[PDB]
Design a protein around this ligand. Structure first.
Ligand SMILES: NC(=O)[C@@H](N)CCCC[NH3+]
Length: 325
């Protein structure tokens, strides 16, 4: 029998609320990743199979005290089938869990974490964001957060916006969300309507698996959405989040800066610049998120062989592109 369990929404939902989760836990409702529950029943590893190589999405979910156990069991179970195990988008404070198994780390980027309490558009340099907000407020756009269950009529209106936003592009997966009705029923959906009540944009609000932190997964808008649409949505989102009592917002991962000062090869360099599309949501520009003055939280790739790092990145990139062969 193949390693891991079939993705089960009911079991996952029960687990994430009774044991807790992380930033990438909600992505398990896409049904495109296999699950590996620990024998303790307190920890969970989500992953995807690519040939003889398994790619884990993030750190384990659940009780952190069972994290060494689930990693031990998962790696052992993969040792039997002779599979290579890769960990994608883990955090620094959990490096000790993987270092003992001889894993190396590579910084993929940083997540923009915006303080909702100290965020404002009243700043002297915040004249740009305040102008965008005022214009949307002037033209009569309204922001609303809807709760599941959602009707077909509502989903149809979201699909029209989504399809128009996608264009000729197809959906990505694994570490990114896509338009699935089952998945969309699992969380609140925030919409932006015009004066005529026409939905021109939508976002799905991702569950609190931390302190007072929230985030979104999908952010899509139609062609009739005004310029600065993405900036406007985050402003409305931050306003709503602060109103609900949330402390922080995760704007998703952004590419690293040029550091400022080598293990760099031409192989690795070409792969990374090719990759700048599949790992950074909303905008591939770090400056887009940086202007919100966020606290950067690094995400790392856990690998074993350094010479196989360029290939590893390609396999993960294609996995996000929904191809495993
Ligand atoms: N999951 C997301 O961030 C979606 N808003 C876009 C994914 C497909 C991009 N071509």
């Amino acid at each position: 029998k193949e390693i891991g369990e079939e993705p089960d929404p009911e079991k996952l939902e029960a687990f994430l609320e009774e044991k807790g989760g992380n930033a990438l836990s909600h992505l398990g409702f896409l049904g495109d990743k296999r699950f590996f529950y620990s024998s303790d029943g307190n920890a969970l590893i989500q992953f995807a199979k690519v040939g003889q190589r398994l790619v884990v999405l993030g750190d384990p979910s659940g009780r952190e005290d069972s994290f060494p156990l689930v990693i031990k069991e998962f790696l052992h179970a993969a040792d039997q089938k002779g599979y290579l195990v890769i960990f994608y988008q883990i955090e620094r404070e959990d490096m000790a869990l993987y270092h003992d198994f001889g894993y190396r780390f590579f910084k993929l980027g940083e997540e923009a974490i915006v303080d909702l309490d100290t965020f404002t558009i009243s700043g002297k340099k915040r004249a740009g964001l305040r102008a965008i907000y005022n214009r949307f407020e002037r033209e009569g756009y309204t922001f609303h957060v809807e709760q599941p269950p959602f009707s077909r009529e509502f989903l149809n209106e979201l699909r029209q916006v989504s399809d128009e936003w996608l264009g000729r592009k197809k959906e990505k997966g694994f570490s990114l969300g896509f338009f699935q009705e089952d998945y969309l029923q699992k969380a609140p959906i925030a919409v932006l309507k015009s004066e005529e009540g026409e939905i021109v944009a939508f976002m799905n609000i991702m569950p609190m698996y931390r302190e007072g932190e929230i985030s979104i997964d999908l952010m899509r808008y139609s062609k009739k959405a005004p310029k600065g649409i993405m900036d406007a949505l985050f402003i409305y989102l931050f306003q709503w989040g602060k109103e609900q009592g949330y402390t922080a917002f995760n704007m998703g991962m952004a590419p690293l800066s040029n550091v400022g000062t080598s293990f760099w090869t031409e192989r690795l360099a070409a792969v990374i610049f090719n990759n700048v599309s599949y790992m950074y949501s909303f905008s591939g520009l770090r400056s887009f998120k940086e202007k919100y003055k966020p606290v950067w939280r690094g995400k790392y790739l856990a690998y074993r062989k350094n010479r196989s790092l360029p290939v590893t990145m390609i396999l993960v990139t294609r996995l996000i592109g929904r191809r495993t062969k």
